[PDB]
Structure formats: structure tokens, C-alpha cells
A paper describes a structure:
The intracellular bacterial pathogen Legionella pneumophila modulates host cell functions by secreting multiple effectors with diverse biochemical activities. In particular, effectors of the SidE family interfere with host protein ubiquitination in a process that involves production of phosphoribosyl ubiquitin (PR-Ub). Here, we show that effector LnaB converts PR-Ub into ADP-ribosylated ubiquitin, which is further processed to ADP-ribose and functional ubiquitin by the (ADP-ribosyl)hydrolase MavL, thus maintaining ubiquitin homeostasis in infected cells. The activity of LnaB requires a motif consisting of Ser, His and Glu (SHxxxE) present in a large family of toxins from diverse bacterial pathogens.
Further efforts using these mutants allowed us to obtain the structure of the MavL40-404(D315A)-ADPR-Ub complex at a 1.93 Å resolution (left). The combined surface area of the interface between MavL and ubiquitin is approximately 867.6 Å2. In the complex, ADPR-Ub engages MavL in such a way that the ADPR moiety linked to the side chain of R42 of ubiquitin is inserted into the active-site pocket and the binding is coordinated by several pairs of hydrogen bonds provided by G223, G225, C226, F227, K236, P264, N322, D323, T331, D332, and D333 of MavL with D39 and R42 of ubiquitin. E107 and D323 of MavL hold R42 of ubiquitin in a position suitable for catalysis via hydrogen bond interactions (middle). In addition, the side chain of D323 points to the 1”-OH of the ADPR moiety and the -NH2 of R42 in ubiquitin at a distance of 2.65 Å and 2.69 Å, respectively, thus is most likely the residue key for catalysis (middle). Unexpectedly, the N-glycosidic bond between ADPR and R42 of ubiquitin was cleaved in our structure, which may be caused by the residual activity of the D315A mutant. ADPR-Ub was detected in cells infected by wild-type L. pneumophila and its level was elevated in samples infected with the ∆mavL mutant, and complementation with MavL but not the inactive mutant MavLD323A restored the phenotype, indicating that MavL functions to reduce cellular ADPR-Ub.
Author numbering:
A (entry chain A): 42 to 404
B (entry chain B): 0 to 8, 10 to 72
Write the structure that this text describes.
């Protein structure tokens, strides 16, 4: 139902991590060790794909990585965090509303079909020690644009490649809506400067790889606030900066941007995801909150992840758990209660971008 | 008009609020008092995160209730 993707550089990080464990240079963090502890095979007996899937399976439905993660092995190690932040996941979705936050959402008369690509932003906040992403992209406390570009390129390019080819297979082009990934909770102390850095990173990826993306057409970048409206031709692509908090009446994230429609385009929305969380994060705890939780709640994301058939609620703009679950219950009925009760795990097929820019198996 | 308590991981913020105040409204009052942007505020009550677009009333948050702010 969903597809996990990662870069060639991340695949190298995983192979090195496995080898590092087998050579005794590292020990698994508690939550990885917990998933590993359920296995009959040791680490040296696993192949790279199983190993990767079990590290991804250590994610929890809801985690607040900017505040309640310690990066010291009592939950995850930095070595695991460097991998998990690079993992993205896509899935087909029904979009029941336009993705407006809070009470601002507008329901679609007939729900539209499209795709989500969950991608974790740079984790530039922490409750405890420095994060992997802080070490990667900060030079003595200062944001390095080229390093941030490289990070987002590593994380986003596999999804752009995936939907370039899927638009081709569907004989359409792709329209992609993108939020201000990493500019909210994950921005930490960089809240006040991060907005143009993320915009610049998106422009650099598209310009650098434009010749690999002939079926990508329109990019709708909506940072919400902190950026100015703009439109830029990037190769063949139309890249629009459209902050819906400063311009009124703009298209939502879960809606066709101007110039696209269901006949000519597939609609894909990027979700600002989270290193240690299942897709949707906040909404597993019933909160239709943040880009991640809003987009999950406003789609059938939870059905694609759990395999269950939920019910959309027009009043609260929300895909709810199945009636066969909520009906008898006197309490504790949100999607995370559904996963605890049914032993659901987050484990799916994984592909990696290879030397030639093709998605393929990890071996 | 009433008062609630927002505990941090700690320094307890006292807020002046109305049952009809939305969570974003409450978050904005926290910003005025503490300088934390709403985008970087997670508010928990009775073990659940409070979401934009609902009101204190919706969560049955009454006078002198304690909320928990999660910060980096
Ligand atoms: N009322 C609003 N309406 C629409 N967009 C908004 C609003 N307020 C802010 N934005 C924009 O929404 C955009 C993204 O804000 P965030 O979701 O925090 O981005 P991140 O990647 O830093 O946080 C990711 C973490 O939060 C989740 O829990 C994930 O699971 C991660 O744990 C910003 O550009 C805001 O301008």
C-alpha cells in the first residue's frame, strides 16, 4: 500500500551501520534493539533489506523529536537518526479536503485522488544534545545553505524520481504541492532565518536535476508565511511561491494548483514528516495538527498504513477509525489506540536510488 | 473569563482565558508572554495534544486546569 524510499548515500549509511554492529563498533538503540529482539535471526544473519525494514519499524506512531528524543541510545542513536531522517514514504491517497489547518479546511465535493510523499525535514531542534542534522548542516552554529541543499536533495530526489516515472506511466505530468518543510517545529533556534533557506534548497534541487524530471511540470511551494509570492521557470518546470497566509484565496496543499487538473496531471503533496514517527504523527494521537497530522487526517493515510477502512468525518475534516472499532468503545478510540489494539507495525517495501538515478532493490 | 496553568518541563505560566478561546489563541497568549512562536508550541491536556481550531471548552478545560507545554 505504501512505498519506502531512500538515497544511495543513505543506503551506504545503512550498510555501514550493519557492518558497524557486526564488528562491535556500535550498539543498537533501545527501540531498534526492541524490534531486533523480536527476531530469530541475528543481525549478521539478516540481509540488508530486513535490517533496513526493522530499523524503520522502530518508529512510533507519535513522537515529538524536537523535544522528547535524547539521541543517546536510550531511544535512538545519532547513527540511526542519520538514516531515519533520510527515509521517505509515498502512498496513493484519497484527499477529502484541501488541507487547511484548524477550522479553515474546505471539504472537496467529491474527494480527489492523488499521492502523498512523507519526507522528514532538517531536525534543527533538540531537547538534549545536538542532532545529526545539526551536525550536518551547521558550521559553528550558522546555517550552511549548500549543506542544507545537499540534505534536502538526498531526501527529496528519490520521491521526485518516483513521481516523474509514475506521471509517465499515467501519461500525465506531475503537479507537486510543498509546504514549508522544517520551518516550524523542526527549525528550533533557526525559526527566524530558515524560510529562504528551504525555498533556496527546493530551487537548487529542481534546477540541478531538471533534466531527470521531464514529467514534473508544476511545483506549488506554500511556506504559509515568511516568503514573498513569486513564480520562476526552472528548466521546463513552473515553480510558484504561494504563501497562503499572506495571499488570500490560494489553492490548498491537497488540491490542484492553477494550471493542473485530474485529466492532465497526477497530484502529489510532500508532507513535512519526522525521523522517528509513523506517517501522520500527531494525528495518531487524534490531533489534526501540523502539516504531517493535517495531511494524514485529511486523507486515507491511516487506512493505507493500518490496512483498515476508516470513515471520513466532514464536520471535523477527519478520516476516523473504523466503525467496527469505535462503536463499542467507551474511550481511547483514536488511530493510535487502533494500532495498540491490533499490533500494527510500520514495515513496508523499500527501494533505493542507485548510481544511475533509478529506484531499485537495496542489493 | 478564567485562568489556567501551563507547565513547562518548571516555570508555570498563568494565562487569562475564555472557554471559547481557540488553542491558537491560547498559543498566541503564550507567545506574548514567553516569546515562543506558536509553530513551535505543542500543548497537552489530559494526555492528548490540543489542536488548532478547537476551543478550551471543546476539551472540557475548566478554571485552573493545568496544561503542559512541550518545548525543545
Ligand atoms: N495555521 C497554519 N496553516 C497552514 N500552515 C501553517 C500554519 N501554521 C504554520 N504553518 C506552516 O506549516 C509548515 C510546516 O510546519 P511544521 O509542521 O511545524 O513543519 P516542521 O517540519 O518544522 O515540523 C515537523 C514536525 O511537526 C510534525 O509533528 C511532524 O511530525 C514533525 O514532527 C510551516 O511552513 C508553517 O509556516
Amino acid at each position: 500500500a505504501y512505498q519506502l524510499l531512500l538515497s544511495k548515500e543513505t543506503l551506504n549509511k545503512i550498510l555501514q551501520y550493519k557492518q558497524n554492529l557486526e564488528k562491535g563498533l556500535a550498539t543498537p538503540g533501545k527501540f531498534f534493539l526492541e524490534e531486533l529482539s523480536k527476531q530469530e535471526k541475528s543481525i549478521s544473519e539478516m540481509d540488508i533489506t530486513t535490517f533496513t525494514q526493522l530499523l524503520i519499524q522502530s518508529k512510533k506512531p507519535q513522537v515529538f523529536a524536537e523535544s522528547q528524543v535524547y539521541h543517546d541510545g536510550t531511544d535512538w542513536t545519532l547513527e540511526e537518526e542519520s538514516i531515519l531522517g533520510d527515509v521517505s514514504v509515498n502512498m496513493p491517497v484519497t484527499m477529502y479536503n484541501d488541507g487547511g489547518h484548524g477550522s479553515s479546511f474546505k471539504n472537496h465535493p467529491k474527494p480527489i485522488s492523488g499521492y502523498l510523499a512523507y519526507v522528514p525535514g532538517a531536525l534543527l531542534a533538540s531537547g538534549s544534545g545536538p542532532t545529526s542534522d545539526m551536525k550536518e548542516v551547521l558550521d559553528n552554529g550558522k546555517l550552511n545553505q549548500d549543506k542544507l541543499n545537499a540534505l534536502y536533495e538526498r531526501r527529496l530526489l528519490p520521491q521526485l524520481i518516483h513521481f516523474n516515472e509514475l506521471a509517465r506511466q499515467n501519461e500525465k505530468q506531475a503537479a507537486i504541492t510543498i509546504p514549508g518543510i522544517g520551518t516550524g517545529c523542526f527549525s528550533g533556534a533557526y525559526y527566524d532565518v530558515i524560510k529562504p533557506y528551504v525555498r533556496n534548497a527546493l530551487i537548487h534541487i529542481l534546477e540541478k536535476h531538471k533534466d531527470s524530471l521531464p514529467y514534473i511540470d508544476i511545483i506549488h511551494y506554500d511556506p504559509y508565511m515568511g516568503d514573498e509570492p513569486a513564480e520562476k521557470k526552472i528548466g521546463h518546470m513552473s515553480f510558484r511561491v504561494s504563501p497562503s497566509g499572506v495571499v488570500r484565496g490560494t489553492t490548498g496543499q491537497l488540491d490542484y494548483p492553477l494550471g493542473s487538473n485530474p485529466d492532465t496531471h497526477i497530484l502529489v503533496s510532500i508532507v513535512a514528516w519526522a525521523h522517528f514517527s509513523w506517517p501522520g504523527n500527531d494525528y495518531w494521537g487524534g490531533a489534526r495538527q501540523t502539516d504531517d497530522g493535517v495531511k494524514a487526517a485529511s486523507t486515507d493515510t491511516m487506512g493505507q498504513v493500518t490496512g483498515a477502512t476508516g470513515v471520513y468525518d466532514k464536520k471535523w475534516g477527519r478520516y476516523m477509525p473504523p466503525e467496527s472499532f469505535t462503536k463499542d468503545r467507551k474511550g481511547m478510540s483514536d488511530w493510535g489506540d487502533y494500532v495498540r489494539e491490533n499490533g500494527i507495525v510500520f514495515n513496508g517495501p523499500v527501494l533505493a536510488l542507485d548510481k544511475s538515478g533509478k529506484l531499485d532493490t537495496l542489493e | 473569563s478564567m485562568q489556567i496553568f501551563v507547565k513547562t518541563l518548571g516555570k508555570t505560566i498563568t494565562l487569562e482565558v475564555e472557554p471559547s478561546d481557540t488553542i491558537e489563541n491560547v498559543k498566541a497568549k503564550i507567545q506574548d508572554k514567553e516569546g515562543i512562536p506558536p509553530d513551535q508550541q505543542r500543548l497537552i491536556f489530559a494526555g492528548k495534544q490540543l489542536e488548532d481550531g478547537r476551543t478550551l471548552s471543546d476539551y472540557n478545560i475548566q478554571k485552573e486546569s493545568t496544561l503542559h507545554l512541550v518545548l525543545r
